[PDB]
Amino acid sequence: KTTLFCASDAKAYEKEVHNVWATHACVPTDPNPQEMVLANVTENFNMWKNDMVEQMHEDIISLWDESLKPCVKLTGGSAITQACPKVSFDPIPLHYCAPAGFAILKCNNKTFNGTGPCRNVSTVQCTHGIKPVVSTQLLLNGSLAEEEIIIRSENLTNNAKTIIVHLNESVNIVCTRPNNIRQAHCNINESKWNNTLQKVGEELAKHFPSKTIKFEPSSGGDLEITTHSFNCRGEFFYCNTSDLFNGTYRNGTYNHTGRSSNGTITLQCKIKQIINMWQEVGRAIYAPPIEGEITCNSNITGLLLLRDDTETFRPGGGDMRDNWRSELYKYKVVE
Amino acid sequence: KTTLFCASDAKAYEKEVHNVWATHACVPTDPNPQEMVLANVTENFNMWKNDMVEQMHEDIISLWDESLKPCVKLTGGSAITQACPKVSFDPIPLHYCAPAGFAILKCNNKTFNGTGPCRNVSTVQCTHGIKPVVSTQLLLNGSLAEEEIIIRSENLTNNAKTIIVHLNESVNIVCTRPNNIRQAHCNINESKWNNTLQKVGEELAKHFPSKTIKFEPSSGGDLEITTHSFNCRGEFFYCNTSDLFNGTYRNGTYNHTGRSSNGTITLQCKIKQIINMWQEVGRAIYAPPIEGEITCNSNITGLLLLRDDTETFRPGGGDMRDNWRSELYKYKVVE
Numbered sequence: 001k002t003t004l005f006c007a008s009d010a011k012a013y014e015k016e017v018h019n020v021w022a023t024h025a026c027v028p029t030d031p032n033p034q035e036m037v038l039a040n041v042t043e044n045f046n047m048w049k050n051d052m053v054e055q056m057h058e059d060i061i062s063l064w065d066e067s068l069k070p071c072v073k074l075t076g077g078s079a080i081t082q083a084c085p086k087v088s089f090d091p092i093p094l095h096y097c098a099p100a101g102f103a104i105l106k107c108n109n110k111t112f113n114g115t116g117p118c119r120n121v122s123t124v125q126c127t128h129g130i131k132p133v134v135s136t137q138l139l140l141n142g143s144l145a146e147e148e149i150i151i152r153s154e155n156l157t158n159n160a161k162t163i164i165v166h167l168n169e170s171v172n173i174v175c176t177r178p179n180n181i182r183q184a185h186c187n188i189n190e191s192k193w194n195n196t197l198q199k200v201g202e203e204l205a206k207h208f209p210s211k212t213i214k215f216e217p218s219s220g221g222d223l224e225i226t227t228h229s230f231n232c233r234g235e236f237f238y239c240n241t242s243d244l245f246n247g248t249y250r251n252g253t254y255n256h257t258g259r260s261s262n263g264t265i266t267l268q269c270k271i272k273q274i275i276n277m278w279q280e281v282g283r284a285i286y287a288p289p290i291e292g293e294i295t296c297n298s299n300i301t302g303l304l305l306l307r308d309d310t311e312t313f314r315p316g317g318g319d320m321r322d323n324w325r326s327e328l329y330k331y332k333v334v335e
Numbered sequence: 336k337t338t339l340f341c342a343s344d345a346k347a348y349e350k351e352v353h354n355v356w357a358t359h360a361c362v363p364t365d366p367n368p369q370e371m372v373l374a375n376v377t378e379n380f381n382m383w384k385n386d387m388v389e390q391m392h393e394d395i396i397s398l399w400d401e402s403l404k405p406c407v408k409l410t411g412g413s414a415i416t417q418a419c420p421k422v423s424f425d426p427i428p429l430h431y432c433a434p435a436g437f438a439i440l441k442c443n444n445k446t447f448n449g450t451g452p453c454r455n456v457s458t459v460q461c462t463h464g465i466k467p468v469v470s471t472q473l474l475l476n477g478s479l480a481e482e483e484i485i486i487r488s489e490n491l492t493n494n495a496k497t498i499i500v501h502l503n504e505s506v507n508i509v510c511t512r513p514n515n516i517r518q519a520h521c522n523i524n525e526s527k528w529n530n531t532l533q534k535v536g537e538e539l540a541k542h543f544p545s546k547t548i549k550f551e552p553s554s555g556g557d558l559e560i561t562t563h564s565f566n567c568r569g570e571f572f573y574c575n576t577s578d579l580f581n582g583t584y585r586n587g588t589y590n591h592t593g594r595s596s597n598g599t600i601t602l603q604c605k606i607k608q609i610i611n612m613w614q615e616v617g618r619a620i621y622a623p624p625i626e627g628e629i630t631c632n633s634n635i636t637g638l639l640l641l642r643d644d645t646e647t648f649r650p651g652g653g654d655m656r657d658n659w660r661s662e663l664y665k666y667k668v669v670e
């Protein structure tokens with residue numbers, strides 16, 4: 001445990017809030033990348049127990065706190081009012097760096113899970129570009145597995161322990177509200193989704209014996225975790241995944257049972273102003289959505305699942321720390 | 336006639352040279368791109384003389400000139416030395432867009448040829464994403480035919496005219512240099528290769544009546560065109576294709592006579608420092624390959640062939656504007 005510091009390419013002329021925060025909270029990235037190679041090792045890592053995720057989480061909370069300022073913030077029964085200006089919003093990559101004398105080891109095993117022994121291990125002073133993408137169910141704009149899609153879990157036996165599925169091939173999703181003022185929609189190519197769910201399916205089948213592997217929409221709870229919720233240009237999108245996370249892996253093939261059109265899948269999305277916050281326990285009310293075409297062109301780089309002679313899997317999320325472990329499946333701060 | 340402009344998803348924080356170049360040469364990509372399609376049209380096309388190809392060619396020459404700077408540049412008996420640092424190299428998509436009031440119509444007939452009449456025609460302002468992949472014999476990371484494999488030629492009865500075989504199913508190829516330092520190798524699944532060459536064979540049979548259709552390694556001449564030459568992470572790979580382009584198509588079946596092992600084809604590759612330039616007429620000398628595992632996992636999306644009882648086809652290439660025509664088999668700049 002140490003007190004880290006962020007490094008970025010933030011410009012102090014951008015009125016984009018991530019830059020506005022990073023220019024006063026981080027350090028200019030340094031053209032100084034010496035990755036200490038090493039092949040004499042055995043370090044055991046645990047992506048599920050690592051303070052880096054916590055400090056990252058905390059100053060991402062600071063970022064959001066002084067950037068996206070809600071009109072009302074209702075916490076503990078007390079309502080706190082302030083100004084609601086819509087701002088420029090799009091995540092910039094943040095490197096996490098260890099201070100004087102403190103190093104950040106690094107795993108290079110391309111099939112490494114997160115928990116256990118790793119050995120082809122390098123070392124750094126600063127980490128690799130990471131975007132503070134806040135989302136549920138679908139991990140957006142992250143790293144891709146260099147070889148093949150991998151399953152991460154603090155334990156896979158525990159049905160209530162979140163599964164992070166690190167993908168390989170990015171799945172472009174295009175969410176948009178056209179020029180109802182709150183209704184939007186997302187578009188995703190169906191072929192590549194069937195594709196990806198056959199990889200997810202067959203690996204889950206590698207690690208669950210010989211059973212039918214169903215994919216279904218989340219049980220219940222708040223809209224934040226029952227839908228693919230994300231932020232696009234300061235607007236909070238809640239997009240439906242009932243005709244997405246939907247299919248059956250049997251016989252070694254995956255059969256999609258979600259609806260489709262022209263070879264594309266369209267998610268019904270809604271922009272909301274009242275949001276169950278991820279930082280704290282409370283609700284934030286924002287101003288109505290801005291005028292015009294509100295579109296995000298994103299790439300799915302991972303999944304967040306939850307398990308219950310058949311085994312059903314369901315989109316998860318809610319705890320953004322696990323979002324941070326998708327990219328902090330780790331390193332290791334060490335001395 | 337016009338001078339176009341590029342549009343891309345280049346990041347100003349990336350130190351990858353395609354991003355470095357595009358960010359100062361291109362325009363932030365448009366995501367309001369609505370194909371106003373038409374159905375009372377018939378326009379003629381000619382992928383084999385289209386100036387968009389040489390605008391792209393000139394611009395990619397610019398990119399390579401300002402990015403990959405060789406230690407030595409020998410042209411016309413005069414040598415030019417400069418600093419040759421190793422860089423990060425991975426092609427990003429480039430949309431080519433027409434300026435004010437001037438448009439880019441589009442062909443929609445998927446069984447389309449490249450030369451002649453076409454009727455289902457749309458029109459856009461910007462082309463689809465095209466990655467400037469510089470290679471010979473094999474076209475990498477291109478678009479796939481939506482339907483069935485297409486044979487393209489300026490004309491097919493001219494044996495000196497390059498033939499572009501637009502594939503349907505991509506064929507995965509994994510070139511790697513393991514941790515001799517310049518010795519590398521490529522892996523390709525044979526069954527997929529047999530499979531592809533059977534309809535390459537069948538349609539080349541459709542265009543050449545009742546001949547035995549053989550596939551053999553190239554002529555001779557410079558290694559760039561006698562080998563599958565390409566660029567992986569700044570390193571110039573020359574890969575042997577004597578056991579790849581090798582087969583007999585007869586009586587309706589393809590027959591692979593190239594050597595294999597465990598059902599896989601392994602190409603013998605070498606990383607060279609002395610390169611015959613594709614941009615200009617001259618040679619370039621680069622620094623020795625970097626340390627570590629150099630891996631490129633690519634998809635074969637097209638072929639570059641040349642024709643001579645029997646008709647024989649050999650891998651071609653060398654002139655990269657044909658590589659740009661593979662993706663610019665086209666559209667059209669029109670008013």
Ligand SMILES: CNCc1ccc2c(c1)C[C@H](CNC(=N)N)[C@H]2NC(=O)C(=O)Nc1ccc(Cl)c(F)c1
Pocket residue numbers: 134135136222224225228229230231236275276277278279280281282283317318319320
């Ligand atoms: C089984 N999983 C456990 C689980 C489940 C749900 C949640 C947690 C843990 C933590 C958090 C509790 N806070 C609260 N209830 N007010 C709650 N998450 C959120 O409200 C949340 O992410 N909102 C949110 C905001 C913005 C965007 Cl863009 C977004 F995509 C989502």
Ligand SMILES: CNCc1ccc2c(c1)C[C@H](CNC(=N)N)[C@H]2NC(=O)C(=O)Nc1ccc(Cl)c(F)c1
Pocket residue numbers: 469470471557559560563564565566571572610611612613614615616617618652653654655
């Ligand atoms: C019938 N065919 C005619 C024909 C034949 C060969 C060539 C041309 C035309 C053009 C070009 C001439 N330039 C020269 N002779 N210096 C020459 N091509 C190249 O040198 C070339 O592609 N190099 C190259 C570099 C890097 C990578 Cl990664 C690569 F895959 C290839």
